[PDB]
Design a protein around this nucleic acid. Structure first.
Lengths: 459, 171, 65, 121, 54
RNA sequence: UUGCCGUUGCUAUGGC
């Protein structure tokens, strides 16, 4: 029987399943291809039930869990073959986590009702230190310095991690065995973020040498290097289109890279508190941009260190909408600790009123692709879920989840169920210190673990 | 370039010696080239000043020249006036040269070390390998100066001598 | 890994063909032969090798493209 | 009236921290109070930057006495967390110094800040 | 205080570690109009914790 | 559900 027949069979059965579920079939079929048109087509934010979400925090042994990448198989309509690597792995949801202890851990997250379940791990250490001391010889199988970022391949066949060791190691998903190591070939080329082009084998790896690198995992080779940032490229986001977006931290710039045209678009906040104060007749000036996620092929959101969450449009260079001090202000330092003075009133004068106060940083920020909902994270102790307006010109706080306590290093979301009826699980790495370094003062109650929240929508 | 009016003045010889030593130039021809450029710029600025203020010619060409000089970096952002264009000197132009910028950024230990690095194709501005020391660096290109990806100092494989001695050591 | 990239694609049914400007990124490689580009262009565009012609290739100074 | 004085506003703080980051890349930054006292004693300090939230603040109130005697501009920024981040080190920094260098690539940017600190004082 | 061993290889480390903490306490005392002992205590406890560690 | 140390149930969270 020819494969044309086989596609015909799977197609015919698939239609019957659609008919069994139910005009409607035509509408549903158009929705299957909405991914091709880079426009938000998942308008379900109102349906969410933030209040009734089932939250759970799973403690993990390792210190300072830095990142988490969730792999979710998807049935390809074109060939009706699930993305799962193997038949045993059918419909199984996996999560991969990395920490500063040089350990990569995978979990099974198929069961929303149950907590994540550890499956396998591989740990690095001094054994892997390169003797040669040359960059092109930095090809040891394991890590020897902090791991920072992880990504799980859309085909489910590889998970690749990078960190301060200036290496890119790709791991086989099943056995967590090293299969290839790609050096960055730079004295300061530390990897700061990774992104898989949606439903493809291409990597975009952001490095501390102010460049973005791209790889093709299937061929195990690097393709091009992108230039233009004036400062470290802390975070990077990608969708199915080759339009990867990045943020430059202190440069206060978000650069969208059109790989197809070999051109880049510069977006700068340019928010100045003189005008913001004048129009008002406490505001903090932005210091750096850390987190970025691409809501749509034509939109993206960024989170700065001044607690400002911005919405951007490819058409406009300046932000279309900003939410200042989204996560709130840090509590004031203790007056008993500001100075050693005995007299209280003199200690209070040290606080200088409210001048010393600062806003929380947006440590994490994730948007469900082609959707109108995105999640923000900080060490305020609560994850915040937002909704973008239908016209994609504004947004509002949909709700909050109070389970998480500590620095939110990275957030992920996974869904299950039929098209109409879906349950969403929110997985976020929580650590006791910020991923890049140890600046943040220790937060009361912070614990290293994987925060979880299952949410279903009704209406 | 154009020869100065009286090349043999003692003050001129000592000036050229100082500039050469400080920026490691090869010949007085480089100094003459920069001086000729500066002379044209300053003469234009003067002729604009002679005109009346609010003159459309003065305004248009004046802001054009100020914008260009700022873009090259010689004129700072806070001095956007032709009067300061008259106050420019040859040292400002020589400083913007790629040799001097490479020296200052810390990539080389000396101006001559910077020259041999650049002429040896070890220095890249963005994506492009620039082996021309007299290359002029703008503002935006100032931060993008780095070692070229192909350079052994840039992470590629070692030069001829390194691997040759490695082979001789291994055998 | 060599990357072959087509821009300025014009369909010319008068001569019955497609014209474009091809960019070949070949890091750590001298240059990519006309024949091998004919192969990869054929595979990408789903046309026989014999139907693919390339000319006017110039490497950028310093290499890499 | 407060011990930490003058304290830079938001707009100025952004510019100060920017210079610190550039100085760190060029090896022109001395981080930490003990280094800062050493720079003032050697008189190689363009200016000193201090954290107004340093806990307790008195721990760095010896620097102004050095700064005012030797005629070196100084300023306080509200955050030690931010100051450490811009400095490029992985821990909070309460005091940092910009070493003197007339051959520096960021000379013009430094002097731009130095005038503004002087006006504030 | 190195001529009379006021603050006093592992032995050397505690001296230098203690040497810094003395400078820390001195600054608080000198520039404070009415110095207290709150910060001296937590400083000493901090030195102690280092002591058992070595 | 934790590297170590507790508390709380028959499960949940306090410190390092």
């Amino acid at each position: 029987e020819n494969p044309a027949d086989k596609r015909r069979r799977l197609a015919k059965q698939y239609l019957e399943n659609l008919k069994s579920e139910a005009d409607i079939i035509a509408s549903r079929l158009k929705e299957d291809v909405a991914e091709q048109q880079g426009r938000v087509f998942r308008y379900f934010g109102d349906k969410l039930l933030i209040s009734e979400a089932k939250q759970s925090f799973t403690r993990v042994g390792e210190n300072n869990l830095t990142c988490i990448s969730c792999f979710q198989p998807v049935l390809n309509k074109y060939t009706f073959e699930e993305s799962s690597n193997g038949d045993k792995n059918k419909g199984r949801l996996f999560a991969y986590t990395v920490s500063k202890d040089l350990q990569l851990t995978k979990y099974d997250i198929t069961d929303f009702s149950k907590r994540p379940k550890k499956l396998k791990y591989a740990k690095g250490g001094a054994k892997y230190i390169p003797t040669s001391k040359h960059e092109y010889e930095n090809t040891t199988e394991g890590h020897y310095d902090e791991i920072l970022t992880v990504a799980a391949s859309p085909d489910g066949k590889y998970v690749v991690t990078g960190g301060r060791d200036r290496k890119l190691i790709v791991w086989s998903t099943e056995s967590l065995s090293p299969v290839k190591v790609i050096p960055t070939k730079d004295r300061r080329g530390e990897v700061l973020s990774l992104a898989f082009r949606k439903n493809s084998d291409q990597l975009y790896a952001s490095c501390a040498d102010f460049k973005i690198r791209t790889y093709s995992i299937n061929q195990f080779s690097q393709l091009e290097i992108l230039y233009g940032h004036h400062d470290i490229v802390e975070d990077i986001s990608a969708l199915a289109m080759e339009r990867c977006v990045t943020v430059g931290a202190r440069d206060r710039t978000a650069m969208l890279w059109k790989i197809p045209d070999e051109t880049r678009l510069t977006f700068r906040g340019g928010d100045e508190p003189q005008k913001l104060l004048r129009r008002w007749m406490l505001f903090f000036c932005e210091g750096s941009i850390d987190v970025v996620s691409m809501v749509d092929d034509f939109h993206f959101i960024t989170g700065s260190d001044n607690g400002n969450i911005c919405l951007w449009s490819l058409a406009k260079k300046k932000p279309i909408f900003t939410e200042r001090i989204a996560h709130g202000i840090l509590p004031e330092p203790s007056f008993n600790d500001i100075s050693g003075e005995t007299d209280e009133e003199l200690r209070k004068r040290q606080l200088q009123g409210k001048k010393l106060l600062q806003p929380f940083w947006i440590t994490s920020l994730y948007a469900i692709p082609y959707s109108n909902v995105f999640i923000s994270g900080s060490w305020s102790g609560s994850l915040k879920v937002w909704k973008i307006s239908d016209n994609l010109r504004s947004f509002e706080l949909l709700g909050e989840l109070s389970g998480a306590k500590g620095v939110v290093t990275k957030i992920q979301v996974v869904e299950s169920g039929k098209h109409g009826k879906e349950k969403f699980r929110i997985l976020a790495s929580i650590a006791k210190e910020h991923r890049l370094g140890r600046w943040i003062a220790n937060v009361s109650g912070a614990r290293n673990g994987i925060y979880s929240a299952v949410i279903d929508q009704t209406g | 370039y154009s020869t100065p009016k009286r090349p043999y003045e003692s003050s001129r010889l000592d000036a050229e010696l100082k500039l050469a030593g400080e920026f490691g130039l090869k010949n007085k021809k480089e100094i003459y080239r920069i001086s000729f450029q500066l002379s044209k710029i300053r003469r234009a600025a003067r002729d604009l000043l002679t005109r009346d203020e609010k003159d459309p010619k003065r305004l248009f060409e004046g802001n054009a020249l100020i914008r260009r000089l700022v873009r090259v970096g010689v004129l700072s952002e806070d001095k956007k006036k032709l009067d300061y264009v008259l106050a420019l000197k040859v040292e400002d132009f020589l400083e913007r040269r790629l040799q001097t910028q490479v020296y200052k950024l810390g990539l080389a230990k000396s101006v001559h070390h910077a020259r041999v690095l650049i002429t040896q194709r070890h220095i890249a501005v963005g994506k492009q390998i620039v082996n021309i020391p007299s290359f002029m660096v703008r503002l935006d290109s100032e931060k993008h100066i780095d070692f070229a990806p192909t350079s052994p100092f840039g992470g590629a494989r070692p030069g001829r001598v390194a691997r040759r001695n490695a082979a001789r050591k291994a055998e | 890994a060599v990357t072959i990239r087509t821009r300025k694609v014009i369909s010319n049914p008068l001569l019955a063909r497609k014209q474009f400007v091809v960019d070949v990124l070949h890091p750590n490689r001298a240059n990519v032969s006309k024949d091998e580009l004919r192969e990869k262009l054929a595979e990408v565009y789903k046309a026989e090798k014999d139907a693919v012609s390339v000319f006017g290739f110039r490497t950028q100074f310093g290499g890499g493209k | 009236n407060p011990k930490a004085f003058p304290l830079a506003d938001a707009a100025l703080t952004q510019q100060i921290l920017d210079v610190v980051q550039q100085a760190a890349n060029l090896r022109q930054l001395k981080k930490g109070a003990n280094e800062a006292t050493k720079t003032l004693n050697r008189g190689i300090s363009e200016f000193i930057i201090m954290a107004a939230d340093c806990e307790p603040i008195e721990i760095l109130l010896h620097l102004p006495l050095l700064c005012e005697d030797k005629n070196v501009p100084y300023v306080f920024v509200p955050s030690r967390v931010a100051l450490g981040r811009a400095c490029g080190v992985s821990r909070p920094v309460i005091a940092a110094s910009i070493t003197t260098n007339d051959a520096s690539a960021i000379k013009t940017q430094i002097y731009a800040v130095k005038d503004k600190i002087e006006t504030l004082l | 205080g190195a001529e009379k061993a006021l603050f006093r290889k592992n032995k050397g480390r505690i001296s230098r570690y203690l040497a810094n903490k003395c400078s820390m306490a001195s600054r608080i005392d000198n520039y404070s109009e009415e110095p207290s002992n709150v910060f001296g205590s937590v400083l000493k406890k901090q030195v102690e914790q280092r002591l058992e560690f070595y």
